[PDB]
A and B are shown apart, each in its own frame.
Chain A
Amino acid sequence: YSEDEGDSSVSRAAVEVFGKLKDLNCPFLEGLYITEPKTIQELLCSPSEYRLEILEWMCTRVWPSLQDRFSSLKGVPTEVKIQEMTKLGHELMLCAPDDQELLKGCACAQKQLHFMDQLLDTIRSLTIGCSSCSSLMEHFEDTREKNEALLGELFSSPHLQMLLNPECDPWPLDMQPLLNKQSDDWQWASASAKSEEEEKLAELARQLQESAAKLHALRTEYFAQHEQGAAAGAADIST
């Protein structure tokens, strides 16, 4: 029951979203330099026509057969493109066949932003693949060769028993009996401890605040009757 950090985190995530969109220099970058984080959040997370335009132009860029079915078979409702994009997301192993509430725009901000984040990551990967390779055939062959080289080098070492079994032993030999003294007294405390930890955090920070205030007040009250002896304190105690 604490949603204060989530909206700010979504706003910051939208800030690097807008920066990443500005990096690629889209042809429709003119006229809309929206930079306030919450405005970017309600632009690219609430249902708006501009985000749909960006995604449909991107999907035209990455795969031409959808635009072939567009122009050759014009007269298509918008929800048909919505369900088609949901499907093409689905065999990206990303969403369900009926997750058209994503493409409608009404979906919650965080997972839409995350979804388009791996989407732009795949865009970046295909772009750097096609940068050094002239054709799709050459890029495909080079990707095959580099992937078989990678899978060859992963499984050529006897050190993977640490990878498959991540150990938890950086401790010395004199500390384990401290664990074994109360080794069976923890399995219940990890149930609903998040709200408990945050409420001790809040009230203990509060206690820190008022303790600092009271010690400062007491020190100032002590110094109120001390400044007449502050100048007189130069005399040594033993003398």
Chain B
Amino acid sequence: MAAANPWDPASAPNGAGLVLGHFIASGMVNQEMLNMSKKTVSCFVNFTRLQQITNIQAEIYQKNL
């Protein structure tokens, strides 16, 4: 009985991802018309900037040591 990992199960099911997976299988949508719709904007900009700042302070503390 090799059950799934309680701390690493299947990932958190997004409703958008699940409906896109089940509706690609419908055949109306395919991969390619999603592909040029894959616009990449930078979100979490406060989070990403503060995270790289904290990373930088980690090696500042290290380098000082």
Contact = CB atoms under 8 A, between A and B. Distances in A.
Interface of A: 124, 128, 146, 149-150, 153-154, 157, 159-160, 162-163, 170, 190, 193-194, 197-198, 200-201, 204-205, 207-208, 211-212, 215
Tier of interface size on chain B? 20 to 34
B49 A197 contact: yes
Interface of B: 12, 15-16, 18-19, 23, 26, 28, 33, 36, 46, 49-50, 52-53, 56-57, 59-60, 63-64
B53 A201 contact: yes
Nearest to A212: B63
A150 B16 CA distance: 14
A128 B30 CA distance: 13
Contacts of A170: 12
19 contacts: A128-B33, A146-B28, A153-B23, A153-B26, A154-B19, A159-B15, A159-B19, A162-B15, A163-B19, A170-B12, A193-B46, A194-B46, A197-B46, A200-B53, A201-B53, A204-B57, A208-B59, A208-B60, A211-B64
Contact of A201 (B12, B26, B28, B49): B49
Residue in A160, A193, A197 with the greatest tally of chain B CB atoms within 10 Å: A197
Do most interface residues of chain B lie in helix, strand or loop, or is the interface mixed? helix
Nearest to A128: B33
